[PDB]
Amino acid sequence: AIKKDQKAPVVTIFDARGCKDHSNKEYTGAKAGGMEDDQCVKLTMETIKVGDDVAAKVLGECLSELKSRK
Amino acid sequence: AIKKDQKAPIITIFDNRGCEVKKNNYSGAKANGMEDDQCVKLTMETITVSETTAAKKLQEFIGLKATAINVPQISGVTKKY
Amino acid sequence: FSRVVTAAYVGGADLQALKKFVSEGNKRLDAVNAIVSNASCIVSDAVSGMICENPALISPSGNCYTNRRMAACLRDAEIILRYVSYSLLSGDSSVLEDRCLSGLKETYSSLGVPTAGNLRAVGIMKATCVAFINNTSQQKKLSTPAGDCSALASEVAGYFDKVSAALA
Amino acid sequence: AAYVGGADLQALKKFVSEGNKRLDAVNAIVSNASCIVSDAVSGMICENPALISPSGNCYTNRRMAACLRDAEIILRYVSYSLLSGDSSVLEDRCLSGLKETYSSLGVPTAGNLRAVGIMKATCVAFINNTSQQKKLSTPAGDCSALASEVAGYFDKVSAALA
């Protein structure tokens, strides 16, 4: 059943092959010996929130594009 | 010179031909024509981006690979400047 | 990933193993990347398309009147999109049905959140995600190696269909 | 707020070139403003990821917000230049003094040049209806002059910040 806490999984995909300037310290499991050592998936569970700024800007777009009838 | 109040013109385009809702924001002379159903709104307001939004956009950007459909690709993996 | 739902970092040998536990692991991760990295647009395009086709939704009588209501609607569309993105990552709809859809229709009925608008918002998001996966752009205008992702697209389409069925 | 409708709007349309088409072109920007800003700041960053490294200028929510904000400010003054048919307000209220502000803060020039370039390309595609999404319906015709005019406005931004 929905928890009514508005929390949802937030997935981030890091295809970091060739990137050197970030310290790959977040994954602490064994290495693959392959390209996956430069690749990482992150998952967190977060309260999904929408700021008033976005609510107002999306409304502003909407008001600029109500479909004409003719 | 920029005022450093971060205010910019917000323009809304109302082409509301065929809309049955009556609005009275415009107080000038009538067109007796299509422009009685059309309006341009202009305000000058502080442009605001919340830190909630900035956090959410960072998460969308931080993969550094995905794009809109059918657009040029310029992504990289090194510092350019 | 069950732990986090009920921060995880899967990389290296864990990621290598994860890819052999789902079908088409690499393409699946590309599809997730396309969806989550465009989430704000996907969500606002669906909610604003719902509205531009039925402007009464932001009339004083409409359910999306006021920033607070518009924010709640945009939020819900994003909640749905994220649980669909999780279903694509995990290869199944269990968490989507249990944590996103079970009890939602009754919640919307009690709130007066309109069914017609919800179905249209979901339907626009579905079409958008399917198009991101079945993207036939020329390679120079595509972030992934060009190829066939039609099976993944059908799978994501089915997850959106579970949303629509729960809300109708 | 100012509301220009009815006979005042007929006058506006007559006092600029290609009035009705110009409003379609303006609407192609403002009805897509959040996507335009997103593509520009995101592409700036994917080209140069150092911008969101722990020391980069877009690091932290406060700075990211300011950058997203500035891209929108620039975009909106360009949209106003297109509505009015000239760049006087853009130059006076958006560009004059902005390069020294950015130099004092350390806001990187090459980043602004990339963001502005993406915004220009995106606006031109929406105006000409060659974008992937074509949500605004127009009668068929040639809008290349309006597209070139807005391209000129973005180039004045680039010229002022370069």
Ligand SMILES: *CCC1=C(C)C(=O)N/C1=C\c1[nH]c(/C=C2\N=C(C[C@H]3NC(=O)C([C@H](*)C)=C3C)C(C)=C2CCC(=O)O)c(CCC(=O)O)c1C
């Ligand atoms: C706003 C989203 C959108 C919809 C919806 C639509 O239909 N088109 C949309 C966006 C759009 N983007 C461009 C052009 C560019 N976008 C980028 C940034 C992305 N490329 C990356 O590599 C990257 C990081 C991974 C991005 C994010 C770039 C670089 C361009 C090209 C800019 C240039 O100077 O040419 C357009 C214009 C497309 C066209 O010209 O046909 C549109 C419409």
Ligand SMILES: *CCC1=C(C)C(=O)N/C1=C\c1[nH]c(/C=C2\N=C(C[C@H]3NC(=O)C([C@H](*)C)=C3C)C(C)=C2CCC(=O)O)c(CCC(=O)O)c1C
């Ligand atoms: C915003 C994310 C995005 C990026 C980035 C990109 O490159 N394409 C993107 C979006 C996208 N949207 C659709 C389909 C639809 N979008 C809408 C809403 C808009 N249409 C309106 O009339 C309107 C108010 C004026 C809008 C806002 C609609 C209605 C659809 C069609 C849904 C359907 O039933 O088919 C797509 C799908 C591909 C396409 O071009 O249709 C995509 C990728």
Ligand SMILES: *[C@@H](C)C1=C(C)C(=O)N/C1=C\c1[nH]c(/C=C2N=C(/C=C3\NC(=O)C(CC)=C3C)C(C)=C\2CCC(=O)O)c(CCC(=O)O)c1C
């Ligand atoms: C038809 C598209 C429609 C239906 C159907 C519906 O239920 N609601 C509809 C439209 C609608 N309009 C607005 C807000 C504004 N409309 C404006 C247009 C004009 N104002 C005028 O004075 C004239 C005559 C020249 C117009 C053509 C303007 C300026 C609007 C904004 C007012 C403001 O600044 O607040 C909405 C939003 C909700 C509302 O105000 O009713 C809707 C839903």
Ligand SMILES: *[C@@H](C)C1=C(C)C(=O)N/C1=C\c1[nH]c(/C=C2N=C(/C=C3\NC(=O)C(CC)=C3C)C(C)=C\2CCC(=O)O)c(CCC(=O)O)c1C
């Ligand atoms: C290369 C693209 C790059 C340059 C150049 C630069 O200046 N910054 C660059 C990358 C970058 N990465 C990140 C954040 C994360 N990168 C992650 C990747 C991995 N972590 C690992 O352990 C492994 C091994 C399997 C990875 C491939 C992760 C997980 C990141 C998120 C960290 C978090 O959630 O806290 C950034 C953001 C800023 C930073 O932390 O460095 C940048 C700019």
Ligand SMILES: *[C@@H](C)[C@H]1/C(=C/c2[nH]c(/C=C3N=C(/C=C4\NC(=O)C(CC)=C4C)C(C)=C\3CCC(=O)O)c(CCC(=O)O)c2C)NC(=O)[C@@H]1C
């Ligand atoms: C439909 C989804 C789109 C499409 C996808 C496509 N991708 C590939 C190949 C690869 N994709 C990846 C991506 C990742 N692997 C990871 O571990 C991670 C980080 C978590 C990512 C982002 C990889 C590694 C590959 C292998 C090739 C490479 O090393 O670059 C293909 C090719 C076929 C295949 O299965 O390998 C395809 C078709 N292509 C499209 O056109 C659709 C829009």
Ligand SMILES: *[C@@H](C)[C@H]1/C(=C/c2[nH]c(/C=C3N=C(/C=C4\NC(=O)C(CC)=C4C)C(C)=C\3CCC(=O)O)c(CCC(=O)O)c2C)NC(=O)[C@@H]1C
């Ligand atoms: C380039 C921008 C695209 C293009 C535009 C195009 N538009 C028209 C005709 C009209 N455009 C409008 C738009 C508005 N008028 C308003 O008052 C408002 C609200 C403020 C809007 C949004 C209208 C009303 C018309 C019809 C005018 C009439 O009297 O019939 C054309 C036709 C040529 C012309 O100059 O009228 C064109 C070419 N078309 C494209 O294909 C490009 C993608």
Ligand SMILES: *[C@H](C)[C@H]1/C(=C/c2[nH]c(/C=C3N=C(/C=C4\NC(=O)C(CC)=C4C)C(C)=C\3CCC(=O)O)c(CCC(=O)O)c2C)NC(=O)[C@@H]1C
């Ligand atoms: C947008 C497309 C539609 C719309 C949405 C709308 N929803 C609400 C309020 C609620 N939505 C939820 C949904 C969830 N809670 C969860 O925990 C989960 C799963 C993780 C979901 C999907 C809930 C619980 C509420 C009420 C409580 C709350 O907001 O915290 C609103 C506001 C309703 C009101 O009367 O205030 C709106 C506007 N509205 C539309 O018109 C579109 C069709």
Ligand SMILES: *[C@H](C)[C@H]1/C(=C/c2[nH]c(/C=C3N=C(/C=C4\NC(=O)C(CC)=C4C)C(C)=C\3CCC(=O)O)c(CCC(=O)O)c2C)NC(=O)[C@@H]1C
């Ligand atoms: C984003 C593409 C780029 C970038 C942006 C960035 N800007 C700032 C700070 C400021 N920006 C302005 C700009 C204006 N103020 C105005 O009144 C107007 C005209 C209406 C404009 C254009 C100003 C005044 C500031 C400073 C004051 C303030 O923000 O309130 C920042 C923050 C700088 C800091 O160190 O805190 C940033 C990050 N940064 C980039 O990396 C991109 C190239």
